Design a protein around this ligand. Structure first.
Ligand SMILES: c1ccc(-c2ccccc2)cc1
Ligand SMILES: c1ccc(-c2ccccc2)cc1
Ligand code: FES
Ligand code: FES
Ligand code: FES
Ligand SMILES: [Fe+2]
Ligand SMILES: [Fe+2]
Ligand SMILES: [Fe+2]
Lengths: 433, 182, 181, 430, 180, 432
């Protein structure tokens, strides 16, 4: 059995080394579900997914299926999609509106809150209904986004997010009207470990600025333009969370990235005009040059990843050490013009979906990485994560927090250190910030 | 934004015309399965709408909500200009998803032909199995139907494509990508 | 035994070949869009709908591959029993198919044979049936169908007098046969 | 290895709680194959599956390829479908008639008894020493069971007090039963204990929501669920020793009619054949003609519904999967019209496409899927139903008896399960 | 191998029909294991070829298929096919005894007009579903390129060339006991 | 944990017994990756696969993806196909020519030697010479390319030992040497490697009895049948003094080879100046190469060949329950055009996935592994007693330990060597 000593010898942020066994080991994964997922704050979706009373969304927390459902008091509850009689699924559609939920096996009946309200033949047999039925999850919201956690001793979402908050507001708090999700949730299966996907959106601008997306940029650039004529952005910054494993990277003053992905109309909306400058004032407390911020990525540990410029957001659902499910959707400002919404929608489909000219290539890399790790020698020696080590500083005038160069792996090392920390430390008294 | 049984004409299309549509699809399948992307892209008319809606698990009563709508995210929702960029990507030798290329087979059957309000324009229904094999052992099998609007054309295939909607038999995509054309 | 389809020396006219192929394409469109009552209407009151069990046999025993008319089968149905199945599949409380599966019936290899009765034809065909359900469940079926089709003033041009499906499976790899073949 | 005290921690019949991990854990299944399946009596079929010398049926004994074959002296011995040379399958086909079995790999020849008779170039070690491993063969009125363990008690001793409950299905005529031609097999991605327990103790599913569409299927087209009568009267049996159990309805004719139809309900309840069955089983003192919708499980994986007369074996295939092997029994002398009715209705209801079976299996599949999650295996499942209300002094039915909607037989199945892999030797397991 | 060079003079409906019907007739023969009659459809000068297929970078695309001096899955004349038929019908051919349950679903049939009367090059797509033993399922997809010469036989045509282009690099099946 | 005592009990070479768990156990497989595959000499192919500078072949060492690539200095280097940055595959195609290798993920550039030369934004954000893909030892035997991870393992020549003269039968017939016919056929069999390793090592017994009855019928004239075709009997079986290598051949019986390879290939192999030059070159142990017909050999653990037929393969493991068969064909570089073509035709006809011989092979192997899921199928030992105590080390015809062709002494020694490799941690005891 994996001893805490051995778990600490898997990740080393000092040497900047990663043991490849963290992505492949079956017994390590079984521990992840308990130590990470069963204790973390996990994305389930947006508030606009469940607007009216009784509206529900069938989703996951790790490998555990859950129902997220809007309550009559306008709150939102999350409970395990499992009947505590003999384990049957309580809610059997992806989404919709429920007056009540009813288990199809033996007909145990539940209210929209997830409470057991009726048991057939409860007088002939049997016991208190108020005590039975699906385990409940803690629910916390953050400016439209809905999060959930099982562990009662875990920190609150606000404390969980901490220093990472202002970097989310670039996407979320542009208008007092707030964000609304475009209809649709794309879902697809990738045979790779969840850490690869999580790390990429956390720290890896480096893949976007080099080789991975040379063809994606080619797809969005003017037909008269060639790759050598297109100019890759090079300047920008990266962020590592004070605690958690969170991080974000972005380009500064170089709209070449955003323009190729999103097009001119969207790039204008983001940087020039009445709405773009209104966002600048609203994010006045941070003191960030939001208009100059073009092309941004972010991961909230462990599985909440999003691109504030593109407005694509997704949860990575784990399916063993060799597989994940991507559940992705798109956000728009509530009051953004009809043409702008249509452009956000078209360009997200074009770039960041299973068939997206950008997303096609990310899941090519991750897949080939996992295959290799089946071999013995492939897991024998550490991998390299040493970029920008001892180079990121907290006292930055332009941006708040621990800031480095755009091509760094400081957030990467910070993510894997907290993976090691959750995997090793059993109690919250030690883990909490 | 729902789909139901294709509305076939009570008078079945002429045997000559039925054959022409069938052969056209066999030729289209040939171009794609042999990675002649430029020749395939030439088939797309300037007013092309290339649409593949998301598909969800719904109760029988909520049947009208099974497919995503024209203001929802989709797997594909394309114009000539967006398709152009996709063709530019798939032919690019730094386009990693299709370099090395996949090995595909588009098997086409169940061809149903309907005339439209425009002469030499046809609304076409068809079924397909798309078998995709790439790298060493990767196999992705797709099945679905295509709803096409075809126009007679003076090309080597006999027709061009004005609209295409693909109804895919999947909710969650079981493939890691959709680097292929349907 | 069933063995090779006794195909007629003279090929069916291009009109009849089209009509029967178009019938199967139409039937598949009904099934694939869950138009179960519309599909059921194709079945004649004297329908026999049959899918024998198939076993692994040595060459010395080739005659015993398919189960007989007095043996258990995957399907052995009359108009009445078939309608019971339609009731179940269309029921809001039929859990196997609510939410419904997503199916594709790909039809090919259509060989048309005439009968001794006018307006009546015996047909051989091949199919692949792709079934996707829940989140990630996929079941693929393949086989042949042997039908007696009568010309009919209905929506499809023919009604189904008899159906035998020979399925390319020993043990069923699928947990159910909630679909119609 | 799972410690015998940790195994005893999984199932608690006193509290009425079950550990979900029993349905999912890979290491528990490995123990199952050795401890549970390697020493139980397991159904391979019926005597009519092979009535003549040389007739064989390739079947399974929990992952073991096994072959059962009729002999010249009317015996039906069962051996491993494995050639001890390099492990090749001896018999390649599901069923048929053999003169001799020849391995395709190196040509080791065998008679129909299993004995090694010819080894190519053996003159260039005893022939009788290296034949496939023979199982113990024991029959119960046509039903052929097998067991690897020489220490295991005989068939009659094993079945015990639940024999009268099998006698409801197998001993209605002096002619005996005959298995209809054909054996259906299909794969269910669920644990075998869901399938075993349901046929053992779960009438509650059929009396509530699971089979609403199946009832609708067997009811007239003008009639809907609002006109179907909801059954509430009946009892539940628990076996003394073996892991067997039963449940049935009392005085509800409409339940059987919706499943099996008019002619078979008549045949089971009224007339010369039905009355002859009440006098033949009269020694048990059981009101057999008022018994409807009964379900039964012979431990571990032999389950059937008397009246309906579908019979199946659930095959192990891992913790997350099973193979269901089902056939139908009819009485030998039964009219040609009744045999055709029994055949047609079993196909209609209890097959891979069956209007009842579909919904049975759909529950299990979705349960197994949910148990992939960590938290879904964390809390106990409710198994209390009728807790302590099963007293042994009922005037109608022998043994331990409770109300039909209870889980007393369920706790008896899991109790013996726990025991059959926490106790190594037969000296205590009796 | 490149895109099949279909005739721009779209083949006659009359002939289009009998070519497709032939393949369906042929498919019926193969799935019902009438090997004796299926072999008879092959002319003396027949070439039964199924090349190996490899993963190649775009710049090395010409080397995707194995050449006529390379190893392959199949590369058969008349006397080589004859031998296989003798084995596949044999009682001591245990790869096909117990027989496999197969489906030859055939579509995408394109018939090509050559200068020679009664000779037409024919392309077809296929999916081959192979089930054998208890739970083995092998799924094959690909295309078949043939010549076909008009003959006075039960099926109406004879095969004088068959190239099978399979959609696989590594073969996911344990063997090729079936015919394509 | 598997204790060293437990391993030794799995194989009994004295009683000719086999514990069937070795084909099925998951934990034994993962040990095999380390103890066997992580330190054995493994066939990657032939020198002719990579004839020029930059020419590469993506292959495997066990489950480890590797690149075998010819260098400027005409040497062959083998490295792990794994970007040591984040694990990405560096070489993403099967075979071809490279001037460089670039990681598609973040653009780390490598030279054909496997040296890291460029890292994008290195100056803006550690030594490249230390971060190249892991290298393997590379050695060749008369055309065949082998590789090994373990620096402490013996060299290829010592690894092979006296099994070399039987390898020479195929590889050393002419000074010009062997050259591979184009094409590497690959297919997946759900059986464990050892079944196939064994067959080509010792099991001639299967070809002379029942398995290849049908493949023989395919290579026999139409007018003639199975009765009028004697069933080879006389011949010998060899065991290597160390390493679990083994071979087998018929003596003076052309019926086995004639069926497979035809009249023209047999004539080349047994008659004329070429077969005389072959016996001339192999006179170092005084073994008649003319009389040796239809040979089979396995080099431990996963290399297998049939000297007369000239097919050669590697069994790639993919867990306890599946393998990938990677096979190719060898010919003498100086042989005539008709002879080479006949070799090509008859190998495609007979030993590929659809080969009239190979079809039946997998069919048997698939079935065994399926049965091995059973507990009772894994309870009692298997038989490997054929030819026990009927072999000595001193024959005027053949060198080394030689027994009867239908024996299983070579098989016993293969498992014996496997047993030793699994249980002995240090090469200080394992080496000869
Ligand atoms: C992770 C994921 C996506 C991106 C990204 C993609 C396109 C444009 C700008 C950033 C960067 C890191
Ligand atoms: C193992 C594999 C193949 C053969 C073999 C088969 C036919 C002719 C010559 C050798 C012998 C052992
Ligand atoms: S499973 Fe929900 S009540 Fe039986
Ligand atoms: S395995 Fe049965 S004879 Fe070799
Ligand atoms: S993985 Fe190769 S450069 Fe990052
Ligand atoms: Fe990316
Ligand atoms: Fe039931
Ligand atoms: Fe062999």
């Amino acid at each position: 059995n994996w001893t805490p000593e051995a778990i600490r010898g898997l990740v080393d942020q000092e040497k900047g080394l990663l043991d490849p066994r963290i992505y492949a080991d079956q017994s390590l994964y079984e521990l992840e579900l308990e130590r990470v997922f069963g204790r973390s704050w996990l994305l389930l979706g947006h508030e606009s997914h469940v607007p009216e009373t009784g509206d529900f969304l069938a989703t996951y927390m790790g490998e555990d299926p859950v129902v997220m459902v809007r309550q009559k008091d306008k709150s939102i509850k999350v409970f395990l999609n499992q009947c505590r009689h003999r384990g049957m699924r309580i809610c059997r559609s992806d989404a919709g509106n429920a007056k009540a939920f009813t288990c199809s096996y033996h007909g145990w009946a539940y209210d929209i809150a997830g409470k057991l309200v009726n048991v057939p033949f409860e007088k002939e047999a049997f016991f208190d209904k108020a005590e039975w039925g699906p385990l409940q999850a803690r629910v916390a919201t953050y400016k439209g986004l809905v999060f959930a956690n099982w562990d009662v001793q875990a920190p609150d979402l606000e404390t969980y997010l901490g220093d990472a908050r202002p970097y989310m507001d670039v996407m979320l708090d542009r208008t007092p009207a707030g964000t609304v999700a475009i209809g649709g949730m794309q879902k697809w299966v990738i045979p790779c470990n969840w850490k690869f996907a999580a790390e990429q959106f956390c720290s890896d601008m480096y893949h976007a600025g080099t080789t991975t997306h040379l063809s994606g940029i080619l797809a969005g650039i003017p037909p008269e333009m060639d790759l050598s004529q297109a100019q890759i952005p090079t300047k920008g910054n990266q962020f590592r969370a004070a605690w958690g494993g969170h991080g974000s990277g972005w380009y500064v003053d170089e709209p070449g990235s955003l323009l190729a992905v999103m097009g001119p109309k969207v790039t204008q909306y983001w940087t020039e005009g009445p709405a773009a400058e209104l966002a600048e004032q609203r994010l006045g407390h941070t003191g960030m040059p939001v208009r100059r911020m073009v092309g941004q990525h972010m991961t909230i540990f462990p599985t909440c990843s999003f691109l504030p410029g593109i407005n694509t957001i997704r949860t990575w659902h784990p399916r063993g050490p060799n597989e994940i499910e991507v559940w992705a959707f798109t956000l728009v400002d509530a009051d953004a013009p009809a043409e702008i919404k249509e452009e956000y929608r078209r360009h997200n489909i074009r770039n960041f979906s299973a068939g997206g000219v950008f997303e096609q290539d990310d899941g090519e890399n991750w897949v080939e990485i996992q295959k290799g790790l089946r071999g013995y020698k492939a897991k024998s020696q550490p991998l390299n994560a040493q970029m920008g080590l001892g180079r990121s500083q907290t006292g930055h005038p332009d941006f708040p927090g621990n800031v480095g160069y755009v091509y760094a792996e400081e957030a990467a090392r910070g993510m894997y250190h907290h993976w090691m920390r959750m995997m090793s430390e059993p109690s919250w008294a030690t883990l909490k910030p | 934004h729902f789909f139901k049984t294709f509305e076939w004409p009570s008078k079945a299309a002429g045997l000559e015309l039925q054959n022409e549509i069938e052969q056209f699809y066999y030729r289209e399948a040939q171009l794609l399965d042999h990675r002649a992307y430029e020749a395939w892209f030439a088939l797309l008319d300037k007013d092309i709408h290339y649409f593949m809606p998301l598909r969800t698990n719904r109760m029988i009563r909520e049947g009208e909500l099974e497919y995503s709508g024209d203001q929802d995210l989709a797997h594909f929702d394309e114009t000539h200009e967006t398709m152009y960029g996709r063709i530019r990507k798939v032919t690019s030798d730094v386009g990693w998803a299709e370099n090395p290329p996949s090995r595909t087979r588009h098997l086409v059957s169940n061809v149903i032909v309907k005339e439209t309000a425009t002469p030499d324009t046809f609304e076409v229904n068809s079924a397909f199995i798309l078998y995709r094999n790439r790298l060493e052992r990767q196999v992705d099998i797709f099945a679905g139907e295509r709803r096409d609007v075809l126009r007679r054309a003076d090309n080597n295939l006999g027709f061009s494509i004005a609209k295409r909607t693909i109804l895919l038999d999947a909710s969650t995509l079981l493939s890691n990508n959709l680097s292929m054309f349907f």
